[PDB]
Amino acid sequence: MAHLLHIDSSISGPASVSRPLTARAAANWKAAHPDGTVTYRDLGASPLPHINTASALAGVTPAAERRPEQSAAWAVSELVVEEVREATTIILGLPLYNYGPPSSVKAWVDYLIAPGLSLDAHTRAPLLGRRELLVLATRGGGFGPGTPREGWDHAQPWLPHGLAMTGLEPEFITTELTLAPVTPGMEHLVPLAKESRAAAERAIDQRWVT
Amino acid sequence: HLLHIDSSISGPASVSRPLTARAAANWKAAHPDGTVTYRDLGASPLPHINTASALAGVTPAAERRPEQSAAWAVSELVVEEVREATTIILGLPLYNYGPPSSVKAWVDYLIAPGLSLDAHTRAPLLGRRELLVLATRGGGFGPGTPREGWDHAQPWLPHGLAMTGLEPEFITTELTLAPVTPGMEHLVPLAKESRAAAERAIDQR
Ligand SMILES: Cc1cc2nc3c(=O)[nH]c(=O)nc-3n(C[C@H](O)[C@H](O)[C@H](O)COP(=O)(O)O)c2cc1C
Ligand SMILES: Cc1cc2nc3c(=O)[nH]c(=O)nc-3n(C[C@H](O)[C@H](O)[C@H](O)COP(=O)(O)O)c2cc1C
Known part of the structure; x- marks a missing residue:
């Protein structure tokens, strides 16, 4: 049955570009899936703690012989996987x-x-295949082919490799040049920043509709 | 002075921790009477920057939230160690x-x-310093290999640090999973090649 996992990771608060875009997508989704319920996770506000030496390798150690930190980490893995399942x-x-x-x-x-x-x-x-993973990527500069920062994004090409074992295949809507309006010497790029955001908003508005 | 940073969570299984303690020793040889600060991010990681604690640097010192001041104190102490x-x-x-x-x-x-x-x-305020990075991969990421372009650690670090003026120099030990992993037993030679060629490069420095 139709169910949305809405995850935020922005640490920008009211200045966030990604938070409004994921709220927009989530409300567009709820309207296209009217019996759909929603689970919300804000890794921005409430990040999950780093896996440390004491808590690592829970998945290879049998339950009965885990340290109390590895069992805590395993409980966190059971929760985050359940949410995606x-x-x-x-x-x-x-x-x-x-x-x-x-x-x-x-x-x-x-x-x-x-x-x-x-x-x-x-x-x-893979046990989490046959699912939609929509990723609303925001970046401060421009990283497109034939920009000077081409090859400086190590988030967008990473995520499909990081998840490739699970069967999750991320689909990206990218908003860029989001630093342009707060950055001296990027004033010529503010129109492009506005256009990049509007194009992402169009793609989010046409998602799930015929 | 040397900053020795470990980030392994693999404990006694770690390939990187011995390689970094090797460098620390070869340095304490080539630079005697020098001090050492040790950092274990693996055991004692610095907590994620969160919404409450973020943007400390672009917010004036007076109008910072209590948690932004905490994050700034952590930044002051971290940058100091590198300075x-x-x-x-x-x-x-x-x-x-x-x-x-x-x-x-x-x-x-x-x-x-x-x-x-x-x-x-x-x-940049942390330039003109030596940054030696002992990279450890479980698999093989070389030209033509099926995982070519799947490393998002090594090509990232120079881009992430570029604002500080640190330029990382990499000694890469790869295929460290080969000897403990069935189906990659035909790569244990390259694994032993990689680790010793890396200890070699560590020795000649
Ligand atoms: C701590 C921090 C680091 C940043 N680093 C980069 C960067 O490396 N490259 C870039 O193009 N923009 C960078 N930016 C700009 C962000 O990518 C941009 O503001 C983007 O909109 C972030 O999404 P958000 O607005 O939802 O937080 C950075 C912003 C912050 C707050
Ligand atoms: C949680 C975890 C994830 C790993 N992910 C990868 C991976 O994505 N690609 C890879 O080639 N090796 C991977 N490995 C193998 C490690 O890179 C390899 O064990 C290396 O020696 C790590 O250094 P360490 O022993 O100091 O922790 C992973 C190991 C662990 C424990």
Whole structure:
């Protein structure tokens, strides 16, 4: 049955570009899926803690012989995988911070890669396939082909490789040049920033409709 | 002075921790009477920057939220450790085709206007330092290999640090899973090749 996992990872608060875009997508989804319920996760406000030496390798250690930190980490993996298993659609906000994904999203994927939960512990067959993963990526500069920052995005090409074991295949709507309006010497690029946002908003408005 | 940074979560199984303690020893040889600051991001990671604690550098010191002041204190202490150093030794494992989340957060704290770069000119303030990065991959990411372009740790770090003026130099140990992983037993030669060629490059420095 139709179920939305709405994940935010922006740390910008009221200045966030990704939060309005994921709220827009989520309301567009709820209207296209009128019996659909929604689970919300804000990794921005409430990040999941880093996997540490004490809590790592829960997936290879049997339950009976885990340290109390590994069992805590395993409980976190059971929760984040369950949320994705229940979903037919996942909407993730993905800012580019220091030319990579938010640390919170990297740890969220660390928890999601869990043998027997997200992939078969024996066949290694993906267990979270046949699901929609819509990723609303925001970035401060321009990273398109024939820009000077081409190849500086290590979030957008990473996420499909980080998730590729689970059968989740992210589909990207990218808004760029979002630093242009707050950045001296980017005043010629403010029209492009507005156009990039409007194009993303169009793609979000036409999603799930004929 | 040397900053020795570990980010392994693999404990006694770690390939990177021995390689970094090797560098620390070879450095304490070539630079005797030098001090060492040790950082274990693996055991004791710096917490994620959150909505409450973010944007400390672009918010005036007076009108900062209490948690932004906490994050700024962490940034001051992190940048200090790199400023005090002449050589930086960092262990960079590849976990889920990226860096450890611990290292991504560590770089987030390090990118701080007025500490690692001038708040106004944005001129790098941590340049003219040695940054040696002992990268450890489980698989093989070389030209033609099926996982070519799946490393989002090594090609990322120079881009993430570029505002500070640190330029990482990589010694890459790959295929470290080959000898403990069935179906990759035909790559244990290259695994032993990689680790010794890496300990070789560590020795000649
Ligand atoms: C801590 C931080 C680091 C950033 N690093 C980069 C960067 O490396 N490259 C870039 O193009 N923009 C960078 N930006 C700009 C963001 O990518 C941009 O504001 C984007 O809209 C973030 O999404 P959000 O508005 O939902 O937080 C950074 C912003 C912050 C707050
Ligand atoms: C949680 C985890 C995830 C890993 N993900 C990858 C991966 O995406 N690609 C890969 O080639 N090896 C992967 N490996 C293998 C490690 O990169 C390899 O073990 C390396 O030695 C890590 O350094 P360390 O032993 O110091 O922790 C992973 C290992 C762990 C524990």
